[PDB]
Design an enzyme around this catalytic site. Structure first.
Site, PDB file in Angstrom:
ATOM      1  N   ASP A 234       0.843  -1.183   0.000  1.00  0.00           N
ATOM      2  CA  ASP A 234       0.000   0.000   0.000  1.00  0.00           C
ATOM      3  C   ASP A 234       0.885   1.242   0.000  1.00  0.00           C
ATOM      4  OD1 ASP A 234       0.835   0.370   2.642  1.00  0.00           O
ATOM      5  OD2 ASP A 234      -0.963  -0.586   3.464  1.00  0.00           O
ATOM      6  N   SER A 235       0.250   2.396  -0.141  1.00  0.00           N
ATOM      7  CA  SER A 235       1.009   3.619  -0.353  1.00  0.00           C
ATOM      8  C   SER A 235       1.488   4.262   0.939  1.00  0.00           C
ATOM      9  CB  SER A 235       0.159   4.639  -1.109  1.00  0.00           C
ATOM     10  OG  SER A 235      -0.710   5.312  -0.205  1.00  0.00           O
TER      11      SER A 235
ATOM     12  N   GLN B 175     -11.678   7.157  -6.063  1.00  0.00           N
ATOM     13  CA  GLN B 175     -12.232   7.801  -4.875  1.00  0.00           C
ATOM     14  C   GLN B 175     -13.593   8.386  -5.239  1.00  0.00           C
ATOM     15  OE1 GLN B 175     -11.300   7.523  -1.860  1.00  0.00           O
ATOM     16  NE2 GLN B 175      -9.157   6.899  -1.921  1.00  0.00           N
TER      17      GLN B 175
ATOM     18  N   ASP C 146      -2.672   8.488  -2.502  1.00  0.00           N
ATOM     19  CA  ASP C 146      -3.888   9.280  -2.620  1.00  0.00           C
ATOM     20  C   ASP C 146      -4.201   9.962  -1.285  1.00  0.00           C
ATOM     21  OD1 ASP C 146      -4.733   7.066  -1.157  1.00  0.00           O
ATOM     22  OD2 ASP C 146      -6.551   6.766  -2.361  1.00  0.00           O
TER      23      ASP C 146
ATOM     24  N   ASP D 142      -7.754  -7.484   0.523  1.00  0.00           N
ATOM     25  CA  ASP D 142      -6.856  -7.619   1.659  1.00  0.00           C
ATOM     26  C   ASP D 142      -7.620  -7.264   2.926  1.00  0.00           C
ATOM     27  OD1 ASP D 142      -6.356  -4.518   1.019  1.00  0.00           O
ATOM     28  OD2 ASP D 142      -5.824  -4.881   3.117  1.00  0.00           O
TER      29      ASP D 142
ATOM     30  N   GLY E  21      -0.559   6.073   2.796  1.00  0.00           N
ATOM     31  CA  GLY E  21      -1.382   7.244   3.069  1.00  0.00           C
ATOM     32  C   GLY E  21      -2.505   6.974   4.050  1.00  0.00           C
ATOM     33  N   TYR E  22      -3.093   5.784   3.995  1.00  0.00           N
ATOM     34  CA  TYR E  22      -4.241   5.539   4.856  1.00  0.00           C
ATOM     35  C   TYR E  22      -3.824   5.480   6.318  1.00  0.00           C
ATOM     36  CZ  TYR E  22      -8.238   3.392   7.063  1.00  0.00           C
ATOM     37  OH  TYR E  22      -9.291   3.102   7.906  1.00  0.00           O
TER      38      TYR E  22
ATOM     39  N   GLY F 277     -11.795   4.038  -0.395  1.00  0.00           N
ATOM     40  CA  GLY F 277     -12.747   4.819   0.364  1.00  0.00           C
ATOM     41  C   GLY F 277     -13.914   4.045   0.927  1.00  0.00           C
TER      42      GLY F 277
ATOM     43  N   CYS G 274      -6.817 -27.288   6.763  1.00  0.00           N
ATOM     44  CA  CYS G 274      -5.550 -26.735   7.227  1.00  0.00           C
ATOM     45  C   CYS G 274      -4.905 -27.668   8.250  1.00  0.00           C
ATOM     46  CB  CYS G 274      -5.733 -25.333   7.813  1.00  0.00           C
ATOM     47  SG  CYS G 274      -6.174 -25.216   9.604  1.00  0.00           S
TER      48      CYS G 274
ATOM     49  N   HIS H 211      -5.042 -21.139  10.936  1.00  0.00           N
ATOM     50  CA  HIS H 211      -6.350 -21.610  10.510  1.00  0.00           C
ATOM     51  C   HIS H 211      -7.130 -20.518   9.770  1.00  0.00           C
ATOM     52  CE1 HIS H 211     -10.438 -22.996  10.366  1.00  0.00           C
ATOM     53  NE2 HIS H 211     -10.764 -21.836  10.917  1.00  0.00           N
TER      54      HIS H 211
ATOM     55  N   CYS I 188      -6.494 -27.872  11.824  1.00  0.00           N
ATOM     56  CA  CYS I 188      -7.709 -28.673  11.939  1.00  0.00           C
ATOM     57  C   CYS I 188      -7.441 -30.155  11.732  1.00  0.00           C
ATOM     58  CB  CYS I 188      -8.745 -28.160  10.939  1.00  0.00           C
ATOM     59  SG  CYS I 188      -9.401 -26.525  11.395  1.00  0.00           S
TER      60      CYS I 188
ATOM     61  N   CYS J  78     -12.461 -27.769   7.136  1.00  0.00           N
ATOM     62  CA  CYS J  78     -11.202 -27.118   6.818  1.00  0.00           C
ATOM     63  C   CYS J  78     -10.075 -28.130   6.668  1.00  0.00           C
ATOM     64  CB  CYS J  78     -10.887 -26.134   7.934  1.00  0.00           C
ATOM     65  SG  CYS J  78      -9.356 -25.227   7.724  1.00  0.00           S
TER      66      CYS J  78
HETATM   67 ZN   LIG Z   1      -8.453 -25.068   9.841  1.00  0.00          ZN
END
Ligand SMILES: [Zn+2]
Ligand SMILES: CCNC(=O)CCC(=O)c1ccccc1
Ligand SMILES: CCNC(=O)CCC(=O)c1ccccc1
Ligand SMILES: [Zn+2]
Lengths: 367, 367
Positions: free
Chosen positions: A86-87, A187, A140, A264, A89-90, A214, A304, A333, A307, A302
């Site tokens: 990311d930039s 924006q 931005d 994200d 800015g946020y 935004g 993973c 997880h 689990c 799941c």
């Molecule tokens: Zn899992």
């Protein structure tokens, strides 16, 4: 592999699935990008194709120049696949102080020690180059929710001027121009005419991808979806669409239904550390006493590693005790769950049954 | 595999190397036991053959009966190899409050919430059975350093009465007697005649192994080694000798030179969390600014996964930032280093060059 190539393989309504090819790897879309700023091998094992780095945090600690001296972010972390940055800015708006904004950029005091810093279109692009990221976000000016039409217009207009400056800064740096990609950010708050002006300005400059900025800043899901309904079709259809900072599983599904390709969110990791696990039957808080003797995995389907191996009762005990291992298991997880969600989204679009998946997902998740 | 079989394969002076066979696996000696109360697969990958569980902590949270209901400690943790449990008595002295001691046992208030608990020879053995441990420690009465001859004698004498009660409690429980092993603990502070009386009492009762208790509690290395010099030869030569709570790398080497076969210490894990990494050139504190741009691994020879993949500069940045991943990496390296130390000890005894190894180790570690 090319610097950047986005291909759409299948579509269902406004939803798309396909791939972004870049020098460091292929990104399957719709994509979820975990926020990297778990071992990188574990993040990869969960299915992530790309991770996000926060320019604001990295420029404070360990510092952009230091990361460059040490070989760039990929080498430093040990992640050899694409990274989006990311930039900054946020987080300047949300985390820093003593902020001084101008048409040139912003100066601010670190939230860690009050050291003084500055960002601008040029400096943000430069820092993202020093980090070595593969997808660079234009710098931005953020617009709080709610915003008046006048303030939303002023911030959108400045953001578009800053988008041109970001484009020119990126293009001037040969190594960056030839090997990385640049995304612009739409924006305009909740206002259709401003969203259209922004989309038009960004397309005229030309970017490799387009973010919807935004949103996810207080408006609520109904309003977010209403804004996506008219905003995503304004963007170039043949480039990726990135909804920044989203979000909850149900937000992701609805955003894909509206044409978003990339996501994200800190939620999987933040939730992992605070006892919340995502499951196909909705989130659960593993600290609740009802899990103290529950031998089932976090989620019944799941796949993973957490689990496969450990019970809710085990993770409950670790989290109750404040043990770092508990946060590690919950985080692995949750990130894995998010990737399995994206895989089910991609497969269902590819098979023309994404509408049914979204309906089935919501019925069970909110049961 | 048998319930318990200790075989000595090679000797050099007082040092021994060999194996303990148990139903759940083989333990290579001299052995270091990490304190388990990292994923179990990671602990195993570092080379550990057995881990230690703390009865005091486990009886408070999640509780002994709960662990039994959930299938025992091996199943709960996902560690299928031997586990040694301490008796709980030492942590009652050091961590609990409102303690009431008597010939029967001790009642105490939890340090977490002031709930009331009790331990005794019988209850300690019972809790260790509920946890399912493979090596059970007799319950004894600890002796602070320094201690007068009278108090050291009184505590040793009570500990020997409690050793007989521990033996009888263990033997009465058929499942435990047939599948687990029981170690007795020598007491007597720094006093040779009391150490001899204790050794004689323990051998007359008969145990599967013998711990040297009451050391590493303030006396300093010179005094600890002096006490080991006369205390270890009093114990049965054909059974394992366990030095509880030791310790630093140099302490371990010197204790092996004096006939110790088994060790446990919180140091690798506690140090890992507080920025200290063990190396063949001595400990380093990775938080020190001199490591901020140091691209070398924690240690130049270590073969652990952390040293294969990440730099001192990376770990420095994670630890500076308070990130849990930093503590994970430091802990994995430190436990791996300890196991590599034990492997070098075992190999050098097997080859008749342990005296030279100890000399070389000390010259470099303290350079
Ligand atoms: Zn899992
Ligand atoms: C186990 C993955 N290796 C690392 O994390 C090395 C250090 C690093 O990449 C980093 C990034 C941001 C802030 C602080 C440190
Ligand atoms: C990843 C290894 N599995 C676990 O740790 C499960 C929970 C557990 O064994 C435990 C032990 C002591 C106190 C609290 C929890
Ligand atoms: Zn190492």
């Amino acid at each position: 592999r090319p610097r950047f190539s986005f291909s759409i393989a299948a579509r269902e309504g406004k939803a798309r699935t396909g791939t972004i090819e870049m020098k460091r790897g292929v990104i399957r879309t719709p994509a979820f990008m975990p926020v990297g700023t778990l071992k990188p091998e574990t993040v990869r094992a969960t299915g992530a194709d790309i991770i996000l780095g926060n320019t604001y945090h990295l420029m404070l600690r360990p510092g952009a120049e230091r990361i460059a001296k040490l070989g760039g972010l990929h080498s430093f972390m040990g992640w050899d696949r694409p990274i989006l940055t990311d930039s900054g800015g946020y987080q300047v708006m949300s985390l820093s102080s003593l902020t001084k904004q101008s048409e040139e950029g912003v100066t601010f005091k670190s939230h860690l020690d009050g050291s003084r810093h500055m960002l601008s279109p040029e400096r943000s692009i430069e820092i993202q180059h020093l980090l070595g990221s593969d997808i660079v976000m234009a710098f931005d000016e953020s617009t709080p929710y709610p915003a008046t039409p006048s303030r939303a217009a002023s911030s959108m207009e400045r953001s578009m001027r800053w988008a041109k400056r970001s484009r020119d800064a990126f293009d001037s740096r040969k190594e960056q121009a030839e090997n990385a990609a640049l995304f612009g950010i739409q924006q305009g708050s909740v206002f259709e005419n401003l969203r259209q002006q922004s989309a038009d300005a960004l397309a005229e400059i030309g970017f490799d991808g387009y973010a919807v900025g935004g949103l996810a800043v207080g408006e609520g899901q109904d309003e977010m979806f209403r804004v996506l309904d008219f905003s995503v079709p304004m963007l170039p259809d043949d480039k990726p669409h990135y909804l920044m900072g989203v979000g909850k599983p149900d937000d992701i599904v609805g955003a894909v239904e509206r044409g978003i390709d990339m996501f994200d969110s800190v939620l999987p990791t933040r939730s992992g550390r605070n006892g919340q696990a995502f499951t196909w039957d909705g989130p659960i808080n593993i600290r609740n006493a009802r899990f103290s003797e529950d031998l089932k995995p976090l989620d019944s389907e799941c796949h993973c590693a957490v689990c496969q191996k450990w019970s809710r009762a085990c993770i409950h005990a670790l989290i109750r005790a404040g043990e770092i291992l508990g946060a590690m298991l919950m985080t692995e997880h949750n990130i894995a769950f998010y990737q399995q969600l994206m895989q089910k989204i991609r497969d269902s679009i590819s098979e023309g049954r994404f509408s049914q998946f979204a309906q089935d997902f919501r019925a069970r998740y909110f049961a």
